[PDB]
Design a protein around this ligand. Structure first.
Ligand code: ZN
Length: 255
């Protein structure tokens, strides 16, 4: 599976039949249809004690990994029940500034999209969590092109070392707090993993407020390779999945 003509999202259902399931992600967030839900509590992000370990190129994106052996970086509150630990964060971006985001707002597409992956500690590990309806919590953040993002530069400066599939680099002391918008206003709905195996185990939390990154920041992303070292170069671009059918589900707003 990949993001090309022959192995793109339109092909994933052949190996992962859930691809045409009832709670697939991403989706288009229709802001006039979204329901303001007064019973929605504020989001609770505790990342001051976060421990990053490494960054890797898995062939479809780059993952910044965190030590999830203790409740060091967690998300709670909002529409969530219990504590969710931060495991990794990654992005989805386009070939141009005009596309890249997975989720869309009133059909508007952003340059990229930041996903912070968290798992429900009631289930013991990530592996067990992907087997549950409430096993994951993904915090989605939109990126627009404008001014540079100080907090993202450390990520950008190490991409050169993990250019090809399989590469990894020690990456400690990185604070995720540098990637959050000022407002924590969000939209929430029940969905799924955006990549195979596309398990319908996610509680999506998409922030209203996007973060801005400079054109040169985003440019560095576009220089990665899908392919492994010593293979024809396939730039890592357009690694985003098209919006899926809402199918009855309801998107609620904390605002
Ligand atoms: Zn993602």
């Amino acid at each position: 599976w990949g993001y090309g003509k022959h192995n793109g999202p339109e092909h994933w259902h052949k190996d992962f039949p859930i691809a045409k399931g009832e709670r697939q992600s991403p989706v288009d967030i229709d802001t006039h249809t979204a329901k303001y839900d007064p019973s929605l509590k504020p989001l609770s992000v505790s990342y001051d004690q976060a421990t990053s370990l490494r960054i890797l190129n898995n062939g479809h994106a780059f993952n910044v990994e965190f030590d999830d052996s203790q409740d060091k970086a967690v998300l709670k509150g909002g529409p969530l029940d219990g504590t969710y630990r931060l495991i990794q964060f990654h992005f989805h971006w386009g070939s141009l500034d005009g596309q890249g985001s997975e989720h869309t707002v009133d059909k508007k597409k952003y340059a990229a999209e930041l996903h912070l992956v968290h798992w429900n500690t009631k289930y013991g590990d990530f592996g067990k969590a992907v087997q549950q309806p409430d096993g994951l919590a993904v915090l989605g953040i939109f990126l627009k092109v404008g001014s540079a993002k100080p907090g993202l530069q450390k990520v950008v400066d190490v991409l050169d070392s993990i250019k090809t599939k399989g590469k990894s680099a020690d990456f400690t002391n990185f604070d995720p707090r540098g990637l959050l918008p000022e407002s924590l206003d969000y939209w929430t709905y029940p969905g799924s993993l955006e990549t195979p195996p596309l398990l319908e185990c996610v509680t999506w939390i998409v922030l209203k407020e996007p973060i801005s990154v400079s054109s040169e920041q985003v440019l560095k992303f576009r220089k990665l390779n899908f392919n492994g070292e010593g293979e024809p170069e396939e730039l890592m671009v357009d690694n985003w999945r098209p919006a899926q059918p809402l199918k009855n589900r309801q998107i609620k707003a904390s605002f």
